[PDB]
Structure 1
Amino acid sequence: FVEMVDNLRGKSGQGYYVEMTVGSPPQTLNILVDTGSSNFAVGAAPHPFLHRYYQRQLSSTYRDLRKGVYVPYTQGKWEGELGTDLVSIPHGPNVTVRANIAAITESDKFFINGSNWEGILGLAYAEIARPDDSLEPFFDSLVKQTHVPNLFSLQLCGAASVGGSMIIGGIDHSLYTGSLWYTPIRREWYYEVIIVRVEINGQDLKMDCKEYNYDKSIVDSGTTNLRLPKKVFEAAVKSIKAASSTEKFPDGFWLGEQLVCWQAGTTPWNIFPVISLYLMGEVTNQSFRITILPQQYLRPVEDDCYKFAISQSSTGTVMGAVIMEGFYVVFDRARKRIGFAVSACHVHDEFRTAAVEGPFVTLDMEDCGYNI
């Protein structure tokens, strides 16, 4: 899959995007890769932040579905017009599919002033598609219309320009070391998983594990932070504070309300703890653990200073870029599971590495999931 290596680009905090073509003749667009949503949705009007946009009038293969879509959300809204067209991925498999496209005609706080992308590829499942699960997601269409195996993997590398790989239809073993460890996709809507235990420097937080997944835990390439439920965040910060007593920091830093700075190349990673999440394993009573360094949760702010990239949530646990940048992540849809291996590109130092380890014995893992 050499042709797909390094097919992702981005800027810090603005997401990872892949090049796509839409319409006939092909219109090239940069499209954000989002495992936390399920619509393929592209700018279709000359919004001043956009480098380019889908011009339906120029596409012979375009088909109007004569339906609108309106999507408010936590941090903004978009609206648009549903249709289909021929879609390809130049640095992907050599195929062209007929996919649903939401042509975005109005938005608020959706596009980023300064970014180099113009749409979103929602890679999650039909159930959370807008307006409803009848709007077939892109990857479902890809699998139905081609022999592309039903899986994709992501290597998000970080550093200010970032890069990575989306391997569509498979796995490239040079992008990770050690073994892949798999967690079950609990339900096919978001990529929901179950976290069964949490450690800060080997120290168990000792919370009821249902709190780790209240009301949801997901793997989301479209979220920057590691986001934790309010209660879990509270306990986690308290233990991180304790473990890092050597220096002191204002309450605003932990809350993501201000930054903290050092001199160039003198940053003291060693006084910050590793964070370990144990995930439900493939077998009854078996778990495994993924561990990240402060290089994953203390993120450079250029516009050496750093922001604390763990934050509180009311939507559940969100394993965003902070987690994903430590690992090669395999979205093995064919087998309803997600694999984690140590990433060949993750940022580390001479003392500590991001790690994926197992097996461990963990009882009552099913009880850690939230039910309505």
Structure 2
Amino acid sequence: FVEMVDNLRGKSGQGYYVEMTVGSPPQTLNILVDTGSSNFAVGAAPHPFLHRYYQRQLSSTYRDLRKGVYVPYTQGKWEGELGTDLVSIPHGPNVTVRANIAAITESDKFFINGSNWEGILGLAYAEIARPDDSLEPFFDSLVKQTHVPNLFSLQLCGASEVLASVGGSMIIGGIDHSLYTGSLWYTPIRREWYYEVIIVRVEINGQDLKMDCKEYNYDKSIVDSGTTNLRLPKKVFEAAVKSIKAASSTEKFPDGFWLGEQLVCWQAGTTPWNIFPVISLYLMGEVTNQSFRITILPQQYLRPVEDVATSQDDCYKFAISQSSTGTVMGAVIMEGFYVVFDRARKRIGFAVSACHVHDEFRTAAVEGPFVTLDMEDCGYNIPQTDESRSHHHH
């Protein structure tokens, strides 16, 4: 799959994007690769953060669906007009698909100044598409219209006046064995909406957090390429930070640091990595009572940021943060690993990435199996609203 290697780029903390074309003749746009959502949406009008945008009127193959769409996130929001057009991924499979496209006509706190992307490719499932689940997602249309296998894989890699450039690979339709070492371990997709998974155990430097495992997945756990941080439920975040602070206590950081609101620095090349612990997330295995662990380094959860001031220092941001909407395994987790979104088999694979950042004493790892007798249920059941209950599903 050599032509798809190195098909992702971006700026550290601002998203990985892939080049796509939309329309006839093809307009090129940089599109955020987001496994935490299910819409293909592109800037379609002027915005102070956009260099360029989709112009429906210049496309001979555009069809208007004469329907609007609205997507608020917590942080972030956009709206636009629905239609279809021809879409291709130049550094992807050699095919062209007719897909749904949301033409973003207005937004708030969505586009990111300097990120160099103009749209989003939601790679998750129809259930969480807007306005509803009859708007077929891009990947679904790709699979139905072409012979491309129902799987994609992501290798996200490497992280004074500008942020650092990052690179990665999105392999559509298969697995490229040059992008990983060792074994590939699979965790079930719990339900096809988000890429929901189940964490059964958490350790910080070998030490079990010893919480009821349902807390790890309160109110869900998901794999999301479009989120920078590892985000943890409030209770878990608190326990995690208490344990990391204890490991690192030779260094008394400001509160702002642990809130992700302040950098901490050392003289170039002198960062004391070994005072920061590894974090191990045990994921449910394909077999009853089995699990496997993925282990990340401080090199993953301390994000490097270059101080225009003291550019003579190596400075870092803490990239683990509190959530009220469940665990998010964001780019912090994914930069450790080659991650296989095996939709055909309702599972997510992890292996050690051939490009992850480490040192001479520790590595990110994927290891198993681990076995538990009479393993309880670690999944949470989100309270059912009357609104959601009333939906029909024909």
So what's the TM-score if we normalise by structure 1?
0.98
Give the C-alpha shift of residue 104 in structure 1: 0.2
Give the C-alpha shift of residue 113 in structure 1: 1.0
Tell me what 1:138 maps to: 138
1:118-172 Cα offsets, whole Å, 9 max, x none, are 0000000001101000000000000000000000000000231000000000000
Q: Are residues 77 and 168 of structure 1, via their aligned partners in 2, closer, same or farther at CA, if it must alter by over 3 Å? A: same
Give the C-alpha shift of residue 112 in structure 1: 0.6
Alignment of 1:351 with 2:345, yes or no, is: no
Q: Are residues 127 and 76 of structure 1, via their aligned partners in 2, closer, same or farther at CA, if it must alter by over 3 Å? A: same
Distance 2:50 2:197 in 1: 35
Tell me what 1:156 maps to: 156
Q: Are residues 365 and 339 of structure 1, via their aligned partners in 2, closer, same or farther at CA, if it must alter by over 3 Å? A: farther
Distance 1:364 1:169 in 2: 37
Q: Are residues 134 and 365 of structure 1, via their aligned partners in 2, closer, same or farther at CA, if it must alter by over 3 Å? A: farther
Distance 1:186 1:146 in 2: 27
Distance 2:84 2:188 in 1: 32
Q: Are residues 363 and 321 of structure 1, via their aligned partners in 2, closer, same or farther at CA, if it must alter by over 3 Å? A: farther
Q: For structure 1, list consecutive stretches of 5 or more residues without a partner in the other structure.
A: none
Q: Are residues 22 and 216 of structure 1, via their aligned partners in 2, closer, same or farther at CA, if it must alter by over 3 Å? A: same
Is the CA contact (8 Å cut-off) linking 1:126 and 1:133 kept in structure 2?
A: yes
Give the C-alpha shift of residue 70 in structure 1: 1.3
SS at match of 1:210: helix
SS at match of 1:241: helix
Alignment of 1:227 with 2:237, yes or no, is: no
Distance 1:245 1:47 in 2: 45
Give the C-alpha shift of residue 46 in structure 1: 1.6
1:214-273 Cα offsets, whole Å, 9 max, x none, are 000000000000000000000011111111222222222112232211111100101100
Give the C-alpha shift of residue 53 in structure 1: 0.7
Tell me what 1:147 maps to: 147
Tell me what 1:81 maps to: 81
Give the C-alpha shift of residue 48 in structure 1: 2.4
Give the C-alpha shift of residue 52 in structure 1: 1.1
Distance 1:197 1:188 in 2: 22
1:189-215 Cα offsets, whole Å, 9 max, x none, are 000000000000010000000000000
SS at match of 1:367: coil
1:88-134 Cα offsets, whole Å, 9 max, x none, are 00000000000000000000000011121100000000011010000
Matches for 1:276-355 after TM superposition, within 5 Å = 276-302=280-306, 304-355=314-365
Give the C-alpha shift of residue 30 in structure 1: 0.5
Distance 1:72 1:12 in 2: 24
Give the C-alpha shift of residue 3 in structure 1: 0.3
Give the C-alpha shift of residue 364 in structure 1: 5.1
Give the C-alpha shift of residue 47 in structure 1: 1.1
Distance 1:274 1:113 in 2: 33
Tell me what 2:12 maps to: 12
Distance 2:318 2:62 in 1: 45
SS at match of 2:239: helix
Q: Percent identity?
A: 100
Matches for 1:49-64 after TM superposition, within 5 Å = 49-64=49-64
Distance 2:69 2:372 in 1: 44
Give the C-alpha shift of residue 366 in structure 1: 5.6
Give the C-alpha shift of residue 10 in structure 1: 0.2
Q: For structure 2, list consecutive stretches of 5 or more residues without a partner in the other structure.
A: 307-312, 383-394
Distance 2:286 2:222 in 1: 17
Q: Which moved more, 1:31-40 or 1:357-366?
A: 357-366
Give the C-alpha shift of residue 76 in structure 1: 2.3
Q: Are residues 205 and 267 of structure 1, via their aligned partners in 2, closer, same or farther at CA, if it must alter by over 3 Å? A: same
SS at match of 1:262: strand
1:289-343 Cα offsets, whole Å, 9 max, x none, are 0000000000012291111100100010000000000000000000000000000
Q: Which moved more, 1:241-250 or 1:54-63?
A: 241-250
Is the CA contact (8 Å cut-off) linking 1:183 and 1:339 kept in structure 2?
A: yes
Give the C-alpha shift of residue 345 in structure 1: 0.1
Distance 1:47 1:365 in 2: 52
Distance 2:253 2:49 in 1: 37
SS at match of 1:238: helix
Is the CA contact (8 Å cut-off) linking 1:36 and 1:123 kept in structure 2?
A: yes
Distance 2:372 2:176 in 1: 31
SS at match of 2:344: helix
So what's the TM-score if we normalise by structure 2?
0.93
SS at match of 1:143: helix
Give the C-alpha shift of residue 71 in structure 1: 1.4
Is the CA contact (8 Å cut-off) linking 1:280 and 1:365 kept in structure 2?
A: no
How many residue pairs get matched? 372
Is the CA contact (8 Å cut-off) linking 1:228 and 1:313 kept in structure 2?
A: yes
